[PDB]
Amino acid sequence: GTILLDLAPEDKEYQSVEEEMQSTIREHRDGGNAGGIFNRYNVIRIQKVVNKKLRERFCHRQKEVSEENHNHHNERMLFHGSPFINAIIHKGFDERHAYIGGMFGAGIYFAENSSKSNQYVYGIGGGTGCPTHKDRSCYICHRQMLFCRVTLGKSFLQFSTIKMAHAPPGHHSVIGRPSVNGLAYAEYVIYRGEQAYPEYLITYQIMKP
Template sequence: NLLGPNAPSVVRNAAMQQARGQLRSAIDAGDAKRLKGALVAAKRLNATELSEFEEAILKYKEVRKLPLGWDVSQMVLHREGARMVAKLKLDDPMVFARFQRLLDLTHRKVYTRDRLGQPVPERLQLLTVSAVTNDESWGNYVARREAIRQELNSDIKDFQRFEVDTQAQVSGDTALDACGDSAEVIAGILAEDFASPLMAEVNEVFLYHGTSAAAAEAIKTHDFRINLAGTNAGTLYGRGIYLAENGTKSDEYTTPMADGVRHLLVCRVVLGRVYYTDTKETDPRACEDACLKGKFNSVLGDRKKCRGTFREFIVFDEEQVYTNYILTYKRVATKSAFCDVTCPETATPGTARVIEVHTPDGLAIQAQVPVGIRPGQSFRVQYTPQD
C-alpha cells in the first residue's frame, strides 16, 4: 500500500496535504455531498488521523442532522458502496439484558397457521444485538416522519394513538431478571440512546420484522423493498411491509441458518393515521387504497381480537420504517409430542389446509395438512402435550 505506514515520507506528506485541503474546503462549504466525498477520500489516503477529519465528521453530522450518538467515523470506515452505513455490535451487558427482557415481555405462546406445523418456542434466546446507522435511510425516515406530523397537525380527524406491546406500561408476568423494567421504559431508553425519543404524536413505535440473514443484511443497507413484500408473510392486508409487536409473531417468518441462528429486526416505524380493521375476512385492496389513495398511513389488522392470534401492522411506504437494531437468536424448544394423522376426505388435494386434530392425550389442536398429502394419506404432527 503506497499510502500505508511504510510509504515514503514524501508520498505520505503529499497525501496528507491533499486530504487536508479537501477536508478544509468541504468544511468551509458546509455541503453534505462535498463533506462525504472528502471524508471518503481521506479514508482512502489513510488520513483519518488529521484533526480536519474529526472536524469534517462533526460538520457532516450537523449538516445531515444525524443523531449525536452516531459514530460517523465508523460509518466512513465501514461504508457499503456509496452509502454511509455501519452495523455496530453492542456488547454492553445492560443493553443485552434490555433486549432479552423485551423479547420475553412480548412473547406470546400462540400458534398460527403461518408456523406451518412447527411448535411455538418456549422462548427466544438472544445471542447478539447490533445497532444500524444508515445515513441515507435515517434522513429519508426523519423527513417522512416530519411530513406525517405536519399532515396530522393540519387534519387530526380519524387519528388515534395505539399502544403496542413493545411499549406496554405494565411489566407483565415475566420473572424479573437483570433488567426488570417494563417494555415502555425499555423502549424509551433504547430510542433515546440511539437517536431521540419516539414521537407519540405520529404513532412512532418499535416493531419486529422477521427475516433471513441475507435479507437482514440487504435491508440494513438498502431499505425495505415493497416489491418483495408478501414472499414470506402473505398479503392478507395488501402488499406492504408487515411488522409485529410480538417477537413470537415475527419469529414465524424467520429463516434459520445451518446452526439454527435466526434474525429479527427491531424497527422504528411511523404508523401515523392508522386504518384499523378487526374483521375475520379481509379486503387487501381496500387496505392498500386507504393508505395509497386515502389519508391513512398504515393498517392495523387486529387478528388478536377476531382470531385470538396477533395484531399485524402494515405500511406501504418504505420510508416509514427504519431498521434500528438486528437481533440474532435461537428458539428454545418446548416439550414436544407427535401423533400420526390421516388426511380427511374433505381436504382438497394439493392445498395446505388447516384441520382440527384430536391428540392421544385429549387435546384438540389445529394442524396444517402438508402440500402433496392426499385424502386418506397419513402425516405426522408435532405438538405441545399437556403437563
C-alpha cells in the first residue's frame, strides 16, 4: 500500500531537501559518539513516500487541529531517525511505539537538526551501530532517515524535564527550546501519529574528515 518515488537529483525538491539536511548539521556534546563523526552527508537517494490512507488520516487530524487552533495548522518539515523506518513508511507514525525514555514523556520526537535525528537511526543513543560492521560511526553502510511533515498546532514550550502521556490542555504538541546547561538543540514532540507524515525517505551516508 506504499509506493516510493525516487526524486531525480536535478529536481528542485531533491536539492531543497538535501540543502535542508546538510545545513542543519551541528556538533553535539557527546563528541559524535552515537551518530558518529561527520560534517556533511553523502546523499544516495531521496524518495517520496506515497500512501493515500496515511495522507487521509494526516489531513483529517490536520483539519481537526486547524479547527482547534485559529484555523492555522502549524505544519513544519522536521527530521526523524529510527531503526524502524520501513514500518513507519508502510504503516505510518504510531504513538503506541513512542519514545518512553524521552524527556517530554512517551511521545513521538522530531529534531530540527539532521544530526540529532541521525543519533537515533541505529537506535536509542546510537544503539549498537550498523548491522554489518557493528560501528555506529560507519562511513560504509547506507543509513536512512525521514524528512517528515509534522502538525504542531498550538505548541507548548517546556524547557525543563516534564514527562507527560499526552499534549497539554488546549495544545497539540510540546516544543523544547534550547537552554543553557539544559538541552542543546530544539525538540518537537507530538503524541498522535496522525500529526506526522513521512514525506521524504532519505538514503544517505556519513563522510570521514
